[PDB]
Amino acid sequence: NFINLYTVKNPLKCKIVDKINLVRPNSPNEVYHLEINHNGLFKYLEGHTCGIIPYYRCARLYSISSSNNMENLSVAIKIHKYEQTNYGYCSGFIKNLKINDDIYLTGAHGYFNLPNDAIQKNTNFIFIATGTGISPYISFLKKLFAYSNYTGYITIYYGVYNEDSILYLNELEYFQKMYPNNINIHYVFSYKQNSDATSFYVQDEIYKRKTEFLNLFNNYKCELYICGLKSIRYKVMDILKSHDEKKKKRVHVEVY
Amino acid sequence: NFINLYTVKNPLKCKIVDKINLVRPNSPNEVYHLEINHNGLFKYLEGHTCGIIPYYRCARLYSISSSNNMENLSVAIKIHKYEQTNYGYCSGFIKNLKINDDIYLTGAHGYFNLPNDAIQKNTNFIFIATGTGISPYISFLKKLFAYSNYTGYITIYYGVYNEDSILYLNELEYFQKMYPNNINIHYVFSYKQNSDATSFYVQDEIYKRKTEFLNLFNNYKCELYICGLKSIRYKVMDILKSHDEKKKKRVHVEVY
Ligand SMILES: Cc1cc2nc3c(=O)[nH]c(=O)nc-3n(C[C@H](O)[C@H](O)[C@H](O)COP(=O)(O)OP(=O)(O)OC[C@H]3O[C@@H](n4cnc5c(N)ncnc54)[C@H](O)[C@@H]3O)c2cc1C
Ligand SMILES: Cc1cc2nc3c(=O)[nH]c(=O)nc-3n(C[C@H](O)[C@H](O)[C@H](O)COP(=O)(O)OP(=O)(O)OC[C@H]3O[C@@H](n4cnc5c(N)ncnc54)[C@H](O)[C@@H]3O)c2cc1C
């Protein structure tokens, strides 16, 4: 419906209003929050991605971390070094972007959305994420909490290098303090810059909490979301497989 | 030296002479060997990759599986489904390619090469690969064996879905039967289409053969190569880390 309204042949011209570092000084990562002005012209549901065309033409996708009723949209971008120091194609472009610079978007893209009944049915959720995979969850929280008549339970597993590497820490803390009876967040730190290692640490933590995890999934009929690390998918699916199924209708995946 | 002689602005126009399926019928993968005629104009060392521009403009890299003194060059391409059934960008283009069709190349790219002294010093090798990561090793074997005065020892660990998924099986069997005192090949089958799972099976096998593996690496001063799976790197490095170092000069990596 909003899908591929803007493409590489007709991209949506936008403006950068804000560019802020998302990590604290002890993080080895370099990550930027981008505040993008689209004049209310970019159309999306929470969970969608947008394509950025560097140097506007080969677009890269980024999960939108803002919600629908926010004027601007937002995005969280890790700076990739080094190209397989040196910079990745879109990373180098983002690195040198300044506020008020033009930026061209394609989209919306993807199907990593909430079920349409979410607020009415009070659906329960498990969100699993590593690194920038938190983005779509922040946008889910803003929508679900009407950021207020959603009374379901949400559990988040989030793996990162260390404390200072937690993206959107402010939003997460806000939501947990604000709705302590609806939100439980389990942080996992790896202290390994390698992503395959990080997904071991997250699998291990779900492992250690297998009892609550399976209680939530089987008994509370959770919708389970996995994002965005490639090496996180199988390792989590392996905990459900080795214990539990046509649903298999509540697993949602967006990895890269 | 041969690096980026051809780029996206000035690509090398070539012709497809052969396109053959590399896997046998019991393989779930779809993979094509491509025989490319470059009129001796494309310059490369063994271990290099070449960029293919689909629809000639966003290029993808493919390890060259032929050797220098072969008239044509060759490449092995897995068909990626489905885009994150549907097809990946370059995959769809390769899928519909016919013999004698024009194809445009950039390169050469990369640094996954043999040490220049290889044949003189009789350097020993460990090659680790999954799926299409065998490509550069096939080209190493052709060069090293002058495909004949190389008398070093080579050990290969190669993980794939099943027997019918072994790429370049003919070449591998040729080289092992031909030089039984120089080549040892350890096949690993996962029966899992997921790549993270496959890398577990390969780690497990190196595990089981830790004694020979570490004997070859430490005592025979092997040059160690890892290709090409992303999830294979850490898992193998973890076997060297947990047991052993400024060399750390013999580890070579090309993953994706
Ligand atoms: C659905 C989705 C959502 C995403 N959301 C986010 C997000 O919210 N935040 C975020 O930071 N990232 C996100 N990503 C990933 C994002 O697109 C990365 O920024 C991007 O993948 C890296 O692009 P780059 O230009 O920085 O690096 P690139 O230049 O693309 O290089 C990165 C890697 O791609 C491979 N590569 C490089 N060149 C080639 C080539 N020529 N051919 C084949 N392979 C090559 C190499 O492995 C290299 O290490 C998302 C990805 C997807 C699919
Ligand atoms: C050094 C090197 C050597 C390689 N050698 C080989 C080889 O010998 N044989 C071989 O088969 N492959 C090889 N590859 C990988 C090869 O480039 C793949 O064919 C390619 O990565 C997939 O391209 P595609 O167009 O088929 O799929 P794509 O359309 O690129 O999609 C593949 C994946 O990229 C991500 N993606 C898709 N769209 C976007 C987007 N807009 N933004 C960000 N991410 C996106 C998704 O995760 C998707 O699943 C090599 C890669 C490298 C880096």
UniProtKB/Swiss-Prot annotation, chains A, B:
Query: Major location, coarse class?
Result: plastid
Residues the record lists as binding NADP(+): 78, 160-161, 190, 201-203, 229-231
Residues covered by the FAD-binding FR-type domain: 9-115
Keyword Cytoplasm present in the record's keywords: the answer is no
Q: Give the EC number.
A: 1.18.1.2
Residues engaged in binding FAD: 9, 59-63, 76-83, 89-91, 132, 230, 256
Which cofactors go with this protein?
A: FAD
One cellular component term from this protein's GO annotations in UniProt: apicoplast
Q: Name the catalysed reactions.
A: 2 reduced [2Fe-2S]-[ferredoxin] + NADP(+) + H(+) = 2 oxidized [2Fe-2S]-[ferredoxin] + NADPH
Keywords recorded for this protein, A-Z = Apicoplast, Disulfide bond, Electron transport, FAD, Flavoprotein, NADP, Nucleotide-binding, Oxidoreductase, Plastid, Transit peptide, Transport
Q: Which GO terms describe its biological process?
A: regulation of isopentenyl diphosphate biosynthetic process, methylerythritol 4-phosphate pathway
Q: Report the subcellular localization.
A: Plastid, Apicoplast
Note the subunit structure: Monomer. Homodimer; disulfide linked. NADP binding accelerates formation of an inactive, disulfide-linked homodimer when the protein is exposed to air for 24 hours or more (in vitro); the physiological relevance of this is uncertain.
Functional description taken from the UniProt entry: May play a role in the terminal step of the DOXP/MEP pathway for isoprenoid precursor biosynthesis.
The UniProt family comment states: Belongs to the ferredoxin--NADP reductase type 1 family.
* Protein's name according to its UniProt entry: Ferredoxin--NADP reductase, apicoplast
Q: Which organism is it from?
A: Plasmodium falciparum (isolate 3D7)
Gene name, Swiss-Prot/TrEMBL: FNR
